[PDB]
Amino acid sequence: VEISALPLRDLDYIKLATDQFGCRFLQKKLETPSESNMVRDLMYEQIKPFFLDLILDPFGNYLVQKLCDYLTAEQKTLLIQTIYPNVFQISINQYGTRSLQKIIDTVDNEVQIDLIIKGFSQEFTSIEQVVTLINDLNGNHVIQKCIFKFSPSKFGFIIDAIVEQNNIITISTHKHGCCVLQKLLSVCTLQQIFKISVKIVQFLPGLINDQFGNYIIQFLLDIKELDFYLLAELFNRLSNELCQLSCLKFSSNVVEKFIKKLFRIITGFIVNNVASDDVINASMNILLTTIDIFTVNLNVLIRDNFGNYALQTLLDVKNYSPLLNYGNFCNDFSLKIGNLIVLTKELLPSIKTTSYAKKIKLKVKAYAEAT
RNA sequence: UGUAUUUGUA
């Protein structure tokens, strides 16, 4: 009110910074073209010893963020030089996370990025602390910002934290961690995906029927570059428990996605008469083996609250109609799937009670109409 | 008959 009458040279910037209306006033001044540079430079010299304090402040964080839109490269580098050792403390802070996201979002150069990355390194931030950040209500937004803003060549501290011991569990089975991990996997390098997948496969039993972990397995199954090993690797680890996994709430979805993936690979090959040959040969043997397992365990699966979905997915002629040495396979498939259909039809009166009997009957009928 | 989305910081 009378503050606006004073010359900028005489303002008490640190006091204004932590005050709501003082802070709004400074932001307006930064948005004032005639005075922007001068208020920026004057403010900067007075508030620089308090960079960390302001970043964490309920009102100061708004000033710091605004400042990011106006700071010179020199000014921003000095700011980052001041606070990089404190990135953990900042990231878990409800105000700090907003400040740091903005800072990352407006980096000028590689020097600034490397300083930030240095702060997240083990010199200043422990692996345990990085895991905490990944799962933290506030911190996970900072990790995600790094993931989308920085080159994957900088992802070292994140990869290291994930693959350490059993941290893959701690992260994949967490509400926030599961989402962060998917973001990471969508942009990181193939070799970085491999290192994480090794750990995911190693701890598969603690992931496959987890409420969040199951989404991670499914995410891997959508990465085509993993086909050459992931299919066989997953099936080798799980084949003996395939029926039980099919009958559980969360893992049943993983089974369905796995089966649909097998169908899509094999049919895509046949349409072209596209995945590599070895991916295709592997898929054929697993599908046939899967049909055998579902055939043996048909009585449990058709009756189970979750298993019936996996069964229906395997039975759906929409998934495999082109399938009705590709010559020998297509012949073996038609035989095994036809046998499963007739066994299913025989069982229909035994599940008359269930609400999904008609759906299974329709699929049986659809098979007949196609053959 | 079947699963996740955090942030409306003044």
Lookup result for tokens 């969508």? A186
Extract long-range pairs of A41-46: CB within 8 Å, 24+ residues apart: A42/A8, A42/A9, A42/A11, A42/A13, A43/A13, A43/A17, A43/A67, A44/A71, A44/A75, A46/A13, A46/A14
Å separating the CA of residue A239 from the C1' of nucleotide B9: 50
Strand B: list protein residues with Cβ under 7 Å: A 20, 23-24, 27, 58-59, 61-62, 65, 94-95, 97-98, 101, 137-138, 140-141, 144, 175-176, 178-180, 182, 211-212, 214-215, 218, 249-250, 252-253, 256, 305-306, 308-310, 312, 355-356, 359
Q: At what angle do helices A156-163 and A127-135 cross, to 10 degrees?
A: 90
For the packed helices A357-370 and A326-347, what is the interaxial angle rounded to 10 degrees?
Answer: 140
Nearest to A314 by CA among A250, A363, A355: A363
| DSSP SS3 for A359 | helix
> Which nucleotide is closest to the Cα of A218 by its C1'?
B3
Cβ-Cβ contacts under 8 Å for A155 (sequence gap 6 or more):
A146, A147, A184, A188, A192
Q: Which of A263, A198, A210, A179 is closest to A237 using CA atoms?
A: A198
Burial A79-100 (b: 16+ CB within 10 A, else e): bbebbbebbbebbbbebbbbbb
Question: Within a 10 A sphere around the Cβ of A339, how many other Cβ atoms?
Answer: 13
A24: number of Cβ within 10 Å:
15
> What is the number of other CB atoms lying within 10 angstroms of the CB of residue A363?
20
* Residue A145 CA distance to nucleotide B6 C1' (Å): 14
Q: Which residues contact A115 (CB under 8 A, 6 or more apart)?
A: A77, A80, A81, A84
Method of elucidation: X-ray
Give distance CA A306 / C1' B1 (Å).
Answer: 8
Torsion region of A189: left, alpha or beta (phi above 0 gives left; psi -120 to 50 gives alpha): beta
3-state secondary structure string, A297-339? CHHHHCCCCCHHHHHHHHHCHHHCHHHCCHHHHHHHHHHHHHH
CA A225/CA A212 separation, integer angstroms: 23
| Residue where the block lists tokens 């008490």 | A12
Determine the Cα–Cα distance for residues A310 and A297; give it in Å rounded to an integer.
Answer: 12
Q: Percentages helix, strand, coil for chain A, rounded to the nearest 5?
A: 75, 0, 25
Residue lying closest to nucleotide B3, CA to C1': A250
Please report, rounded to whole angstroms, the spatial distance between the CA atom of protein residue A141 and the C1' atom of nucleotide B8: 17
Residue A103 (CA) to nucleotide B6 (C1'), in angstroms, measures 21
Query: Could you tell me the two tokens for A347?
Result: 């069982």
Q: Enter the tokens of residue A124.
A: 């200043």
CATH number, domain of A125, equals 1.25.10.10
Q: Which two tokens stand for residue A218?
A: 């499914």
How far does the CA of A265 sit from the C1' of B1, in Å? Answer: 29
Q: How far is CA A155 from CA A127, A135, A145, A149, in A?
A: 13, 17, 12, 11
> Looking at the C1' of nucleotide B9, which residue has the nearest alpha carbon?
A95
Q: For residue A137, give the nucleotide whose C1' atom is nearest its CA.
A: B6
Q: Which nucleotide is nearest to A356 (CA to C1')?
A: B1
A200 with A215: CB under 8 angstroms?
A: no
Please report where in the chains the tokens 């799937």 appear, as a residue. Answer: A337
The total of other beta-carbon atoms located within 10 Å of residue A183's CB is 14
Rounded to 5°, the CA angle A187-A226-A231 comes to 140
Q: Which domain holds residue A251?
A: 1-371
Tokens of A286: 């697993």
Question: Per CA to C1' distance, which residue is closest to B6?
Answer: A137
Q: Which residues contact A328 (CB under 8 A, 6 or more apart)?
A: none
Placement of tokens 């997953």 in the chain: A234
* N-to-C CA span, chain A: 85
Closest nt by CA–C1' to A176: B6
Query: Residues A111, A70, A183, A181: is their CA dihedral positive or negative?
Result: positive
- A97/B8 CA-to-C1' distance in Å: 16
Q: How many residues does chain A have?
A: 371
**DSSP secondary structure, A180-195, as one string:** HHHHHHHHS-HHHHHH
Helices (H), A239-276: 242-246, 251-271
Positions on chain B within 7 A of a protein C-beta: 1-7, 9-10
Q: Which two tokens stand for residue A26?
A: 């400074």
| Number of domains chain A is built from | 1
**Whether A332 contacts A285, CB under 8 Å:** no
CA–C1' A196–B9 (A): 34
Give me A76's structure tokens. Answer: 């921003």
* DSSP output for A205-251: GGTTTSTTHHHHHHHHHT-GGGHHHHHHHHHHHHGGGHHHHHTSTTH
Q: How far is the CA of A142 from the C1' of B2 (A)?
A: 34
Nearest nt to the CA of A212 via C1' is B4
* Residue for token pair 């049986």: A364
> Left if phi > 0, otherwise alpha if psi is -120 to 50, otherwise beta: which for A165?
left
